[PDB]
Amino acid sequence: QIEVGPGATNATINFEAGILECYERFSWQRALDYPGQDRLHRLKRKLESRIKTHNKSEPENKRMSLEERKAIGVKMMKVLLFMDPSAGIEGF
Amino acid sequence: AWDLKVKMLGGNDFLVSVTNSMTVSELKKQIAQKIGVPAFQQRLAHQTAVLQDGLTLSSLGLGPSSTVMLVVQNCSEPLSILVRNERGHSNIYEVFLTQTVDTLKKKVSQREQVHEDQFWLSFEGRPMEDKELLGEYGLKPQCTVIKHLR
Numbered sequence: 001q002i003e004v005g006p007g008a009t010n011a012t013i014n015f016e017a018g019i020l021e022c023y024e025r026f027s028w029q030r031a032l033d034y035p036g037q038d039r040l041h042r043l044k045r046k047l048e049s050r051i052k053t054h055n056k057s058e059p060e061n062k063r064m065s066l067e068e069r070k071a072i073g074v075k076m077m078k079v080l081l082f083m084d085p086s087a088g089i090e091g092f
Numbered sequence: 093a094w095d096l097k098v099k100m101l102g103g104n105d106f107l108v109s110v111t112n113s114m115t116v117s118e119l120k121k122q123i124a125q126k127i128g129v130p131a132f133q134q135r136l137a138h139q140t141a142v143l144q145d146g147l148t149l150s151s152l153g154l155g156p157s158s159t160v161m162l163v164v165q166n167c168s169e170p171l172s173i174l175v176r177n178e179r180g181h182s183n184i185y186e187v188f189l190t191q192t193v194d195t196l197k198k199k200v201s202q203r204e205q206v207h208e209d210q211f212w213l214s215f216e217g218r219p220m221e222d223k224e225l226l227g228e229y230g231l232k233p234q235c236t237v238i239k240h241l242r
């Protein structure tokens with residue numbers, strides 16, 4: 001059970017957003033089964049709720065949509081998957 | 093004439109009938125006939141090289157031994173485009189790339205109060221046919237479609 005600071009809330013919202021977009025893309029290849037597709041549905045809704053909430057204890061200049069957070073997740077995953085801070089820049 | 097192995101993410105594969113003179117576009121259409129993934133969503137690769145739509149399959153080194161990789165690039169999100177009538181007045185419409193040219197023609201028929209039979213649309217010269225999908229013509233967010241009258 002790894003200790004984390006605060007804002008790991010924001011980081012985890014960002015991470016999971018990127019996770020959602022991977023499901024979105026995987027489903028397009030028609031390889032996500034029907035139960036997995038419900039998990040995608042559930043996950044999208046649980047996230048927007050968590051996003052709206054977090055979008056309140058956040059300064060109005062730092063309110064990011066589901067879509068902008070997806071872009072942040074994706075660059076995170078690009079780092080994790082290659083174990084590389086180079087990826088997520090613009091060209092890997 | 094011979095068959096070509098198309099592999100998809102996940103692992104599944106299937107077979108399309110091709111010729112050494114068939115283009116990537118013609119092949120993409122074949123895939124769209126065979127399993128209903130719009131050509132415009134198809135990104136094809138072979139030996140890690142992405143296949144551009146103009147070249148001939150034999151000129152790209154494909155043969156009955158080959159296996160080609162398919163990735164589907166869809167999108168949930170809609171987009172906004174302009175439709176510039178003949179008088180130079182654009183109007184803003186919200187479209188999905190999976191929608192038909194026909195459904196867009198209806199949004200324009202509603203908004204500009206013109207029978208659908210009385211006009212047709214074009215994108216960068218390429219005319220647009222009712223039954224085909226809007227993605228087939230490469231529409232991008234905030235791009236401009238021209239409306240032609242009769």
